[PDB]
Write an enzyme that holds these catalytic residues in place. Structure first.
Site, PDB file in Angstrom:
ATOM      1  N   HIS A  61       0.883  -1.299   0.126  1.00 15.10           N
ATOM      2  CA  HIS A  61       0.129   0.059  -0.213  1.00 15.10           C
ATOM      3  C   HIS A  61       1.017   1.384  -0.092  1.00 15.10           C
ATOM      4  O   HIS A  61       0.255   2.348  -0.404  1.00 15.10           O
ATOM      5  CB  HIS A  61      -0.806   0.221   1.052  1.00 15.10           C
ATOM      6  CG  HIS A  61      -0.531  -0.453   2.313  1.00 15.10           C
ATOM      7  ND1 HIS A  61      -0.163   0.415   3.422  1.00 15.10           N
ATOM      8  CD2 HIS A  61      -0.382  -1.491   3.015  1.00 15.10           C
ATOM      9  CE1 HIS A  61       0.238  -0.251   4.442  1.00 15.10           C
ATOM     10  NE2 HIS A  61       0.056  -1.412   4.261  1.00 15.10           N
ATOM     11  N   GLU A 103      -3.116  13.404   1.564  1.00 16.26           N
ATOM     12  CA  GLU A 103      -4.461  12.897   2.635  1.00 16.26           C
ATOM     13  C   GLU A 103      -5.028  14.119   3.161  1.00 16.26           C
ATOM     14  O   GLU A 103      -6.418  14.564   2.932  1.00 16.26           O
ATOM     15  CB  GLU A 103      -3.814  11.688   3.150  1.00 16.26           C
ATOM     16  CG  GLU A 103      -3.357  10.424   2.602  1.00 16.26           C
ATOM     17  CD  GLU A 103      -3.519   9.506   3.544  1.00 16.26           C
ATOM     18  OE1 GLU A 103      -3.126   9.333   4.844  1.00 16.26           O
ATOM     19  OE2 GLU A 103      -4.137   8.397   3.148  1.00 16.26           O
ATOM     20  N   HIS A 116       4.684  10.915   6.022  1.00 15.84           N
ATOM     21  CA  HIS A 116       4.023  10.684   7.378  1.00 15.84           C
ATOM     22  C   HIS A 116       5.125   9.991   8.155  1.00 15.84           C
ATOM     23  O   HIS A 116       5.383   8.862   7.920  1.00 15.84           O
ATOM     24  CB  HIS A 116       2.721   9.565   7.348  1.00 15.84           C
ATOM     25  CG  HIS A 116       1.395  10.504   7.035  1.00 15.84           C
ATOM     26  ND1 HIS A 116       0.299   9.677   6.276  1.00 15.84           N
ATOM     27  CD2 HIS A 116       1.343  11.712   6.653  1.00 15.84           C
ATOM     28  CE1 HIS A 116      -0.329  10.590   6.031  1.00 15.84           C
ATOM     29  NE2 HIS A 116      -0.009  11.629   6.286  1.00 15.84           N
ATOM     30  N   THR A 195      -4.992   6.509   9.069  1.00 15.79           N
ATOM     31  CA  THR A 195      -5.662   6.695   7.618  1.00 15.79           C
ATOM     32  C   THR A 195      -5.729   5.621   6.660  1.00 15.79           C
ATOM     33  O   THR A 195      -6.115   5.381   5.709  1.00 15.79           O
ATOM     34  CB  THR A 195      -4.910   7.716   6.726  1.00 15.79           C
ATOM     35  OG1 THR A 195      -3.737   7.338   6.301  1.00 15.79           O
ATOM     36  CG2 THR A 195      -4.895   8.940   7.641  1.00 15.79           C
TER      37      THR A 195
HETATM   38  N1  LIG Z   1      -1.382   6.880   7.040  1.00 12.78           N
HETATM   39  S1  LIG Z   1      -1.139   6.872   8.742  1.00 12.78           S
HETATM   40  O1  LIG Z   1       0.324   7.460   9.263  1.00 12.78           O
HETATM   41  O2  LIG Z   1      -1.932   7.328   9.499  1.00 12.78           O
HETATM   42  C1  LIG Z   1      -0.731   5.164   9.316  1.00 12.78           C
HETATM   43  N2  LIG Z   1      -1.908   4.382   9.302  1.00 12.78           N
HETATM   44  N3  LIG Z   1      -1.673   2.863   9.618  1.00 12.78           N
HETATM   45  C2  LIG Z   1      -0.413   3.283  10.276  1.00 12.78           C
HETATM   46  N4  LIG Z   1      -0.181   1.778  10.847  1.00 12.78           N
HETATM   47  C3  LIG Z   1       1.107   1.818  11.665  1.00 12.78           C
HETATM   48  O3  LIG Z   1       1.717   2.610  11.669  1.00 12.78           O
HETATM   49  C4  LIG Z   1       1.332   0.393  12.469  1.00 12.78           C
HETATM   50  C5  LIG Z   1       2.573   0.703  13.515  1.00 12.78           C
HETATM   51  C6  LIG Z   1       2.502  -0.712  13.953  1.00 12.78           C
HETATM   52  C7  LIG Z   1       1.030  -1.165  14.560  1.00 12.78           C
HETATM   53  C8  LIG Z   1      -0.271  -1.005  13.877  1.00 12.78           C
HETATM   54  C9  LIG Z   1      -0.237  -2.431  13.252  1.00 12.78           C
HETATM   55  C10 LIG Z   1       1.235  -2.234  11.934  1.00 12.78           C
HETATM   56  C11 LIG Z   1       2.116  -2.019  12.985  1.00 12.78           C
HETATM   57  C12 LIG Z   1       1.371  -0.716  11.540  1.00 12.78           C
HETATM   58  C13 LIG Z   1       0.005   0.043  13.106  1.00 12.78           C
HETATM   59  S2  LIG Z   1       0.322   4.372  10.167  1.00 12.78           S
HETATM   60 ZN   LIG Z   2       0.106   7.593   6.237  1.00 16.46          ZN
END
Ligand SMILES: NS(=O)(=O)c1nnc(NC(=O)[C@]23C[C@H]4C[C@H](C[C@H](C4)C2)C3)s1
Ligand SMILES: [Zn+2]
EC number: 4.2.1.1
Length: 257
Positions: A61, A103, A116, A195
């Protein structure tokens, strides 16, 4: 499984992640005339001098660079935050064309991409525990516009050929994320969410007002990545952004007049 296409994109995510329709979802449009300057907001403290990068990875992604977060090495403090938040990873969202990709939006304006930097509150001991807390994560968001090249991004761009498809990773040590920051740390802040799924409502968002400029050649290399794994029909990794969500009962605060 979820993605950004017509049949698995953001309009579908609520069926597996009902919090997609929740009270503090991200991203949001930042209306600059409705955001209120908050003089009680302290300056941001970005302490990246001891950052220890580990790997760069295509996760299907986005692509992300991961850091050693087993110690206070690269941390975010101050601003709206209480306590210490350790940098875990950074990644980007970007578009198929320069007029979309971010975003967050600013007065409905979309930037070409958004960086991010994802941090977690050390009071919860590990990131999995932090994602279950309303103040568990802090994401520093930085807009990208197309113009001059960003030298601190070039080492990332250089290696993208080695992680073209989902699942690929490469060694990415000794990378200094300070090279991705703009001059000013003026910011907007609001309570929001991840997000991407699980869309957990655990994030203090800190969105920098000043974009960074990247070159057309740099963003074009983002657009050559693949959503698919090796051997599958090639689908270019572009437009991996969630659109703005309802602000609901939230106020966006500005650190600057
Ligand atoms: N686009 S954003 O920055 O809002 C993000 N959107 N989703 C994100 N996910 C993570 O950051 C995780 C860090 C660790 C624990 C949860 C399970 C895997 C492992 C990834 C979360 S950041
Ligand atoms: Zn992000």
């Amino acid at each position: 499984h979820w993605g950004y296409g017509k049949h698995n994109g953001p309009e579908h995510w609520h069926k597996d992640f009902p919090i997609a329709k929740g009270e503090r979802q991200s991203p949001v449009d930042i209306d600059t005339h409705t955001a209120k300057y908050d003089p009680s907001l302290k300056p941001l403290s970005v302490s990246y001098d001891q950052a220890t990068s580990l790997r760069i990875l295509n996760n299907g992604h986005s692509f992300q660079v991961t850091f050693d977060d087993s110690q206070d090495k690269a941390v975010l403090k101050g601003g709206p935050l209480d306590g210490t938040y350790r940098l875990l990873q950074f990644h980007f969202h970007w578009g198929s064309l320069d007029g979309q990709g971010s975003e967050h939006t600013v007065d409905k304006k979309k930037y070409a991409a958004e960086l991010h930097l994802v941090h977690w509150n050390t009071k919860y001991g590990d990131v999995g525990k932090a994602v279950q807390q309303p103040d568990g994560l802090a994401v520093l968001g930085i807009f990208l516009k197309v113009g001059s090249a960003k030298p601190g991004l070039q080492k990332v761009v250089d290696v993208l050929d080695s992680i073209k498809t989902e699942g690929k990773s490469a060694d990415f040590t000794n990378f200094d994320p300070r090279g991705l920051l703009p001059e000013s740390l003026d910011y907007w802040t609001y309570p929001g969410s991840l997000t991407t799924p699980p869309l957990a409502e655990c994030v203090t968002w800190i969105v920098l007002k000043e974009p960074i400029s990247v070159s057309s050649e740099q963003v074009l290399k983002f657009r050559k990545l693949n959503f698919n794994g090796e051997g599958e029909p090639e689908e270019l990794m572009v437009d991996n952004w969630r659109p703005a969500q309802p602000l609901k009962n939230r106020q966006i605060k500005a650190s600057f007049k």
